Amino acid sequence: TRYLRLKAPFAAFRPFQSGSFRSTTPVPSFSAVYGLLLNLAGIEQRQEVEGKVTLIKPKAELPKLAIAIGQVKPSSTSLINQQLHNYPVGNSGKEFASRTFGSKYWIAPVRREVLVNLDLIIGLQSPVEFWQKLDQGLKGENFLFDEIYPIEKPDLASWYCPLEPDTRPNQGACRLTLWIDRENNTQTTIKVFSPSDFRLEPPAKAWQQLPG
RNA sequence: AGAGCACUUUUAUCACCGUGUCCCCAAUCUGGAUAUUUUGUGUG
């Protein structure tokens, strides 16, 4: 129905299972977008549990919505190499096995990278109740978001759309994730996405319906 | 409350040492601002 714009000076979207060296994507993943939308709604996550894993999210009940992503200006990236919180991968021993109070004791720096600027025009098709809840949360009683204001109708920009095995893409993102829980599952099938540069509204294929 | 973003860019250090821009030189040589001009006119 109605959509909104946002911007931020710095951002970072680390792909999962990156390993030692971290990376990022020019466009935030769908799951991160959904998490941001849920956080702004003022509704907490369905899971309240603590342990080895803390993403136990059954899909039994969750508001339905369709999400599109826009991009107005390409952004470069930079890298910083300071420190990282290592997880032991070797038998190791000594001091780590002595104290053992949330130890994470071994430390070794490698790398990581961040973005230079972010400005997106996010598109949402949601029921009226969810939009009203968002309005109440924004107006009522990690350097990721700076400010938000709905300027839907003006300020056109490019969009993204999945591509079928034909022709060739340009300036396309590497990987994208729809739904994921950090345990044994099938992850997501569709990975490749490409942008299209045209002024008017995105096509019907651009909108993607999230299972959650 | 966004695929949970911490635990690290950390601790010391003289670009130092000696070194005359020095030694001679002329702005020199001549030239009539010259030629004429009444402060005149009257008052106890």
Side-chain angles (χ1 to χ4, degrees):
Chain A
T1 61
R2 51 196 307 165
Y3 53 101
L4 72 164
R5 199 179 91 94
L6 73 165
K7 90 161 76 171
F10 279 60
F13 309 119
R14 37 147 176 101
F16 210 78
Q17 298 306 90
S18 188
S20 171
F21 167 65
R22 307 294 193 277
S23 178
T24 195
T25 79
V27 162
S29 176
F30 275 128
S31 75
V33 162
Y34 196 41
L36 187 153
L37 289 183
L38 212 71
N39 183 32
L40 272 295
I43 174 167
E44 311 91 3
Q45 202 57 259
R46 79 168 76 258
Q47 50 156 1
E48 307 300 319
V49 285
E50 309 303 323
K52 288 208 62 174
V53 288
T54 52
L55 190 64
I56 304 101
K57 220 176 305 186
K59 300 182 73 68
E61 66 268 8
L62 194 62
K64 276 76 179 174
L65 72 165
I67 308 100
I69 294 174
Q71 203 260 353
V72 62
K73 172 207 68 53
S75 290
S76 78
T77 187
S78 179
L79 59 89
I80 44 175
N81 302 324
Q82 57 274 33
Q83 57 269 354
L84 295 174
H85 44 286
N86 252 333
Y87 233 26
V89 190
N91 28 263
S92 278
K94 216 188 141 258
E95 47 159 293
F96 177 80
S98 85
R99 276 99 156 187
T100 71
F101 317 109
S103 58
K104 204 187 286 185
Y105 279 159
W106 206 278
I107 56 171
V110 62
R111 273 181 191 277
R112 65 188 186 188
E113 64 183 0
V114 293
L115 274 298
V116 65
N117 189 358
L118 187 149
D119 43 352
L120 307 184
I121 306 98
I122 188 168
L124 174 58
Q125 177 171 343
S126 186
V128 186
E129 51 271 29
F130 212 78
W131 169 241
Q132 183 42 58
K133 199 153 288 299
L134 266 295
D135 304 332
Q136 207 277 335
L138 194 143
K139 278 292 196 224
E141 70 274 12
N142 284 331
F143 48 89
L144 192 150
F145 58 93
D146 186 21
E147 87 262 24
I148 300 103
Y149 45 93
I151 312 297
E152 45 269 41
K153 187 61 65 202
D155 211 30
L156 61 83
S158 300
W159 310 98
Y160 277 86
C161 175
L163 73 164
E164 65 274 10
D166 56 354
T167 76
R168 79 281 184 275
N170 55 3
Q171 278 71 47
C174 304
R175 297 285 75 78
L176 279 185
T177 305
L178 310 190
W179 196 247
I180 181 54
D181 46 351
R182 51 200 68 182
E183 56 260 33
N184 193 7
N185 65 345
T186 77
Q187 279 77 22
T188 49
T189 310
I190 175 66
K191 299 288 95 175
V192 292
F193 290 78
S194 67
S196 76
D197 198 15
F198 71 115
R199 315 287 71 86
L200 60 87
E201 298 273 318
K205 198 68 192 309
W207 281 278
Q208 207 282 333
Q209 162 259 315
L210 186 78

